[PDB]
Amino acid sequence: SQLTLRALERGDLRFIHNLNNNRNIMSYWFEEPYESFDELEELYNKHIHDNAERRFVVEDAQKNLIGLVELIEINYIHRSAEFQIIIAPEHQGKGFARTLINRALDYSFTILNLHKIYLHVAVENPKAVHLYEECGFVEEGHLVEEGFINGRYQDVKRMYILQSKYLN
Amino acid sequence: NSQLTLRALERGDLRFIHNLNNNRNIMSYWFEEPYESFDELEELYNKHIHDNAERRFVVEDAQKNLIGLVELIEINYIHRSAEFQIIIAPEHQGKGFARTLINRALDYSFTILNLHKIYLHVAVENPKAVHLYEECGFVEEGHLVEEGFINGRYQDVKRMYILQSKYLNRSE
Amino acid sequence: SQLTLRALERGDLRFIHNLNNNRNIMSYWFEEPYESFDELEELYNKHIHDNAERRFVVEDAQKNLIGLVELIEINYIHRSAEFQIIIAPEHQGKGFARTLINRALDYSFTILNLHKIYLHVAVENPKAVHLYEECGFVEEGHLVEEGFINGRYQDVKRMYILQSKYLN
Amino acid sequence: NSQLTLRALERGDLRFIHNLNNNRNIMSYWFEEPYESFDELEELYNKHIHDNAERRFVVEDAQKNLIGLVELIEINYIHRSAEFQIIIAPEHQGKGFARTLINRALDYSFTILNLHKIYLHVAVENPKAVHLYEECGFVEEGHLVEEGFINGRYQDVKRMYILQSKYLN
Amino acid sequence: NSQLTLRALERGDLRFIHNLNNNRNIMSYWFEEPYESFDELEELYNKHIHDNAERRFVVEDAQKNLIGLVELIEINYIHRSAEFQIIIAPEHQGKGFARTLINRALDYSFTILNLHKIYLHVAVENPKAVHLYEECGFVEEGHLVEEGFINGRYQDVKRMYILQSKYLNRSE
Amino acid sequence: NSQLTLRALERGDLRFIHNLNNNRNIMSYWFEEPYESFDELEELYNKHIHDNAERRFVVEDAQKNLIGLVELIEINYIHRSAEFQIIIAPEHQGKGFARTLINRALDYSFTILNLHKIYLHVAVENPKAVHLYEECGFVEEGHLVEEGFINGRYQDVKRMYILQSKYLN
Amino acid sequence: NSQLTLRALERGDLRFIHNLNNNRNIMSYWFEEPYESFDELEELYNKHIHDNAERRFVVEDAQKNLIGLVELIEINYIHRSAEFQIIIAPEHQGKGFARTLINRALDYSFTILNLHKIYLHVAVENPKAVHLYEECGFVEEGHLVEEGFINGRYQDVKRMYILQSKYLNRSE
Amino acid sequence: NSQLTLRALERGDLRFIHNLNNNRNIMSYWFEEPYESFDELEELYNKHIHDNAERRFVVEDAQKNLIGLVELIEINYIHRSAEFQIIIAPEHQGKGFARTLINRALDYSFTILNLHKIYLHVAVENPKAVHLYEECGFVEEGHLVEEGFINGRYQDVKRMYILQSKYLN
Amino acid sequence: NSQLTLRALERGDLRFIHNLNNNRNIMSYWFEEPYESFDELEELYNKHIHDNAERRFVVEDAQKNLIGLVELIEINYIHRSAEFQIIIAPEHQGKGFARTLINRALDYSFTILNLHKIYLHVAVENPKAVHLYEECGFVEEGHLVEEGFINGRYQDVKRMYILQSKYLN
Amino acid sequence: SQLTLRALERGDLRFIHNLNNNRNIMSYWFEEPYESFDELEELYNKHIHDNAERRFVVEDAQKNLIGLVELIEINYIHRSAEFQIIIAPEHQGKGFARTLINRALDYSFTILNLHKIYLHVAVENPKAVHLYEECGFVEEGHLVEEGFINGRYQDVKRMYILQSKYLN
Amino acid sequence: SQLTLRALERGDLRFIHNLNNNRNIMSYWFEEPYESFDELEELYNKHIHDNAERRFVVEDAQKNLIGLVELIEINYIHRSAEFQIIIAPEHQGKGFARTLINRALDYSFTILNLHKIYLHVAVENPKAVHLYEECGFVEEGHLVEEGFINGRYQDVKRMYILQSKYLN
Amino acid sequence: NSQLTLRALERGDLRFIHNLNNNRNIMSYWFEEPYESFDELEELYNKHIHDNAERRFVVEDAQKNLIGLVELIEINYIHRSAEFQIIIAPEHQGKGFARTLINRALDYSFTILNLHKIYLHVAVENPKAVHLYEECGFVEEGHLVEEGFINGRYQDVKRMYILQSKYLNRSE
């Protein structure tokens, strides 16, 4: 409850770079690949005004960085966006996920007025699917060999939630 | 209240602007383009530094403490109109500084810019503000239904106006 | 029924300039004033990709220019836009207005997925208010001295229609 | 004289403009920048094509024959004023169309742009022009001495005005 | 059908593209930016002429008559994926040219671009097309609900895929 | 009053400029472009730093305390004219230094720039200022009616002039 | 001679300029930058089209035949001075058109530009021209020695002037 | 040797890069463009900072002491190949960390970028290096004769490869 | 076959280029950048028109009928090497003109550009081409395995070379 | 003799601005007018590479700024330039002029290989004409009303010296 | 005598390209290599105003293109330039060389006021050395392996002529 | 002498370059453009930072004291030639460091750049330097008369060369 969401600032880019460490996956910023901190800050400067992606830094009461809440591929004609939450390893198993997931859905459905929010989860991480399922998400796709994760193509589940059910 | 002073907004005041837009829980715009980050605001401020379609004024006291903001937007010099929005910091919201800021704004709009009409928008679910402006000389000219999506619901908003004729004269 | 809507092209700018003649009002293109044809084509080139305004040219079966249907101040967050229809003097009193008004509402509510469409009518043209009223629009504002039309400030009615009623 | 039509200046009309400024014996300006050749004007027309400080109208007749030019310069939208200048081609100078052009100019200034004041400048050594504008509603508000260097001499110039209040009422 | 030929789209073919997007009654995009005018399309074509994230191919016959369009979008060369969309002109829609165009597209994607997966989207209210792709080797991997707003209603769309493994092998 | 020194305006003095334009209750312009914030002025100062249409001088004293500003706008080098404006800080408004600043301004206009005429504008509702310039050599050449919208009213303004011939002789 | 007319130089007249600089056997300049090719001239003309430091005037007759050129260079509006150069085509060099062109030039310089002084340079080895200008009111103010390298030798050049005072008055 | 960590190259590490290229006696390239001074490299690093044709990783230890560099050049994402080069600082050349760096490089090439082939070039006059890569999984696919001008002589160079299939299985 | 003439590539010949790359079933590059449409090539030809890393020659006959293309890519002037590729139109593939084009290419490489080495790449599944270049002076220096993805298969490619020393002597 | 010539640097621009004070004449930098220090530094940056004018700062042994030696309107085809020397008021009457004038002629005739060096002197300052005359310059022109100096047009003498006589 | 020199124009670039054919040497335009006509015209446009090289087209009475006279590496401080004359194969052995060489020296020494004009001749073409020698040029250098001409480094003679001797 | 080290010139060394060009009393060039001020040099250095037609190398000792400069100019990679110029600070001119710098330069030119010929220019009125280079393997190939204007007089300059063949071999 004490956790707060804050729009992403330049200073928070170091926290983004640290979150990427230990993930072992190509990081993208507005659909452009980056791996070093200097590559990131340059693209943050060039996409500063692009409203197709919005990122919020999650902090506690004493302002310790907990994680990141990012909405990508925002389309205002169809009113959809892809949701992705990244919790720092320090606070991964402390139960902050469900609160941050509700905070993200709140901003998406009560400020941006989006119709649908979908996410992508690895089939090889079933407990994460149960998490999002218990948060209101339902499976709508089982993408076969969608991503190349550590030397092999993996299946990824696409799950959605509509504005209708979150508000009612 | 008479110790308050209006000052054209500077770059050093953008921090004060950012802290105002939070807790409002509404999309913040700068020259009709959205923003929610301090850096995003600063870049827009430098890009529209010379754009005269909008003007914003910081209000401070003798202590130089920041009390609120006055902004004119959608300024058109052929029809001589502009939209009016007032925002006072939460710390000074209840000490009745608003009426002074409103009068200072109308005095600038109608005696320096030589505008003909000033309109504003207020939420129908905030009768306190609608009543405040009616006290300051604003008349309702529209009840726009489901014009804004606020807090997960389409709500109505009142549009109220005041003419240069009433402000400058009336007492005459 | 034979009337067709077509996105605005460069060649149609001459028809726009001719429509402005005999109106006696400042013409705007993406909120910028113009009065000569050369001023118009230059701004058409600079705002070619701005999706805040969409204009459709109305033609008949034999492709005679009937009028223009323009949506301005399109906001995809709140899903609103201002509607304006301009019929050429040759075909003004032939009854093409109601058909073109329905065509405009169709594009706005079934392709762009807008929530509200408002228009502005002069109080001194009451029969036009009755037209839009019989088309589904309802008055939501009586703006006092909103526009300067031929040497005097005039009152203008703002009328709206919601996507909910047009679809049902 | 009700046949004459005002039309916003187009790039093609810059030839008509150039021919009118010849025979005048005066430095011609386009948005406060001097020019003399047709090419200099065409380039400056492209640079200031969307500048709202000045506005120029070409006046034609029923046959579309060019009659004259009406230009409003130094347009300030805060004070709501502008300077007015009318130039008729030598072909039609004596046909008595000036008054109609002056009123069609004032009609656009006061009924569409919503300006409060329109002032103009006339040489003191042209009293017929002073009387002309006087009969159109303009009043002398200044006698600027040695304001301009015309024909090798510093000459005095009358500044004349008319307000939106009088023209509308 | 074997007389059809695939040709990289040129500027002279943009007219053929514009005439295709009309009567579809759907927002048309070019490198993920909307357009509905021929001039708007032409300007976008010149701006993304060198962008390799998308490729479009015109298909013509021995008569050099334009039959349809094949386009790859959302191409990513790290995951080696792309989205597939086929559009045949209304005059040739029913003569069974589609299967040839689909195979020509997959042959280009899997033997020249060396892609791993090709996916496409089809409306659930168009079982004819869903069946056509299932015949060509596509398998359903998703039933996205209310993903698209078509003709005044939020509709579901099927996402179907095919892997380079099946296309190149299977017969092996 | 012979201690006062004129110095070309520097970027650092833009603070002094901004503070003077406060308290005036008037729209301030920098090269015919409006501004209100210190940042707006600093940007426009950088854009027009080499524009010769206007020239501004900061006047200091022996202690280098800033006294006032002397600006010449609408400088035309073909007609050899310019508009003059003097603004003294409220701290020294009543010390009677105006006349010396006016003459130091005219001295730069007529002895270095080689201008023929210098005109200025004074509000009719400030007769003390009209008399001041009258005693400095300026003569009224116009009574512009409702020229400016000041303090919520269209007010009349006097236009006053002095020629290079008189000042030098 | 009274049928001659002065016209501001246009792009279509640059061909006439190029043909003039040949046979002169002297470095040709355009806004103080050298050129000897038609294309080199045209590019310089477009680059200095708006530069008011120099002005050139083509002179033509009732037949619209090109007779010569009049150019002002080194124009300075603070000192109100300019350099004067006249060039008549070889076909019309001997019919006494020069005096009219010189007077037309001084009339433009002293009645429109409101200049104070006009100076020119003439070769000491051309007493015909020095005498022509002395007839037109020019007085020698300098005998610059070895100022120019002409035809393989450093030669002297006369600098002659005329003031606005003499031209406008004198008759008075 | 499990303490060594790979980190994407940062602008600050360009000093470490410059010091490594000294002592090599070879023309150094940054995105197929030659350079010699620290300033030339810093400018070209800014120009190609978002170019995906090359990728360079700085390898540190637990103490964050810089150990070496791993760079992948000529990265083609259609053929899924790249050229590999490993450079260890003279301080740690004999500590036997090379093999771990080579495998950490191949792990990023084949497990994240999804490349099919990685080739490298070794001088024939350095058989110890050829054997090293041979024991890491690389096989000779070419003996390029007089490929490079090294130390004043056109020398032969071995081209060695390893496929994603072998490394993963 | 002495009638064939080499001519530097002109913008007009880009049609001939585009038609040759059709029928090849391979991704075509222009200065290491992929393209497929005639418009994409014309734009990239304008961007790299003064780049000296590649050089392409159109070969015609006495009738000026286009015969083929000779392109030298990856030209490095420090190591003095380049990659060679010859493409003959299907119309004249069997007329036996290849050898003359190969030698005319090597003559420009070794007698004008002063290059030391020229290498080329040939598919292993085209032994007739390998023999052809072998009889022209090229020697195999590498058997690159699974170097290219051709016709849906990773195939091996021979790299062949010839030095300036042999060709001149 | 201890006096040294040094190419003009950015830091020396303040000394240039101070030299202009008490001159009461329009200052030009590469034929462009300036009056404030900020105007000067901007034009110094834009004309940094223009070789049509070369300026040298004159200093003593202890590096006190004595004056300026500037060559303007340098033409390498005809090999000519205009010379101008400006001594600070502190050291005006100490006899540094003749030495600095010889230093300027040395650089012009032995490094740039110029054929002619001319200067402009006021007729109303005859002792300055005698100075340059005794330095080798000879009058070649008496320009009438050439410059506007303090409210009146003044005559200016143009005097020259050829490379031939300085070297022999 | 009837031969005329004319500054190089855009249209003459085709003649330049044809002259290069049958030379078998890398062609340079302002020290930049070119081989196709399109490469040449682009560099002609970019170096249109560079006065370090001047080229004149030689024509007859009937305006048939005879050859080219180009001065390169023009230095106005030292007053030197490199001369190069190229006669078309059609008129090579008709004796136009000596006339064109004198025309070039005339322009260099009587209009540009250059002090020295040097040229480069192949040692393996001795009759060309005798030509320039009989025109006033004298050998000042025998450069060893200066140019790579058709598969071998060749020696090149550098010969000069001073303005002093051509004028006297 | 073996403790000397060659280092590519950096921006921090431009001050050392400026102090070298003074007292030489000769026009200083940077990529064939003149300069005589430190700021003029710095701006040219940043503009030609990536130009590979010239390369300059600072030489320093174990003490990191600046000893001199080595520069290659007029580098052409088709003919594989370059011009060589060496400049040692006056404080270290007489301690015989030159021969080491010359050999270091030729070693870089002939073993890294793979150049074929290196030429240099020396004043005929400086037989000390002409003799120094003859000791280092340079042969005179030209006696260019009145090529340079030095100290008010046109002087002759010797052009001397050395080939990659001699440097790399000879001992072989």
Author numbering:
A (entry chain A), C (entry chain A), J (entry chain A), K (entry chain A): 3 to 170
B (entry chain B), E (entry chain B), G (entry chain B), L (entry chain B): 2 to 173
D (entry chain C), F (entry chain C), H (entry chain C), I (entry chain C): 2 to 170
Excerpt from the publication:
Spermidine/spermine N-acetyltransferases (SSATs) are catabolic enzymes that acetylate polyamines and are critical for maintaining intracellular polyamine homeostasis. SpeG is an SSAT protein found in a variety of bacteria, including the human pathogen Vibrio cholerae. This protein adopts a dodecameric structure and contains an allosteric site, making it unique compared to other SSATs. The allosteric site is located between monomers that form the hexamers of the dodecamer, and some evidence has been provided that shows when polyamine binds to these sites, the dodecamer tightens.
Our analysis of the spm-bound structure of VcSpeG showed these two regions form potentially significant contacts: π-π interactions between F32 and F149 and an H-bond between R25 and N152. To elucidate whether these residues could be important for stabilizing the interaction between these two regions of VcSpeG, we created three point mutants: N152L, F149A, and F149G (R3C4-R3C6). We substituted leucine for asparagine at position 152 to retain the overall structural similarity of the residue but remove the ability to H-bond, and we substituted alanine and glycine for phenylalanine at position 149 to potentially decrease the ability of this residue to form hydrophobic interactions. During our kinetic analyses we found the VcSpeG N152L (R3C4), F149A (R3C5), and F149G (R3C6) mutant enzymes still retained reasonably high activity toward spm. The catalytic efficiency of the N152L mutant increased slightly (1.2-fold), and the F149A and F149G mutants decreased 1.4- and 5.3-fold, respectively compared to WT. Our analysis of the spm-bound homology models for the R3C4-R3C6 constructs showed all three retained spm in the allosteric site. On the other hand, when we replaced phenylalanine with alanine (R3C5) and with glycine (R3C6) at position 149, the π-π interactions between F32 and F149 were removed and the H-bond between R25 and N152 side chains remained. While this H-bond is still possible in the R3C6 homology model, it may ultimately be disrupted due to the greater flexibility of a glycine substitution at position 149. The single point mutants we tested in Region 3 (F149, N152; R3C4-R3C6) were insufficient to totally inhibit enzyme activity. In cases where only a single residue in this region was altered (R3C4-R3C6), the disruption to the activity was far less.
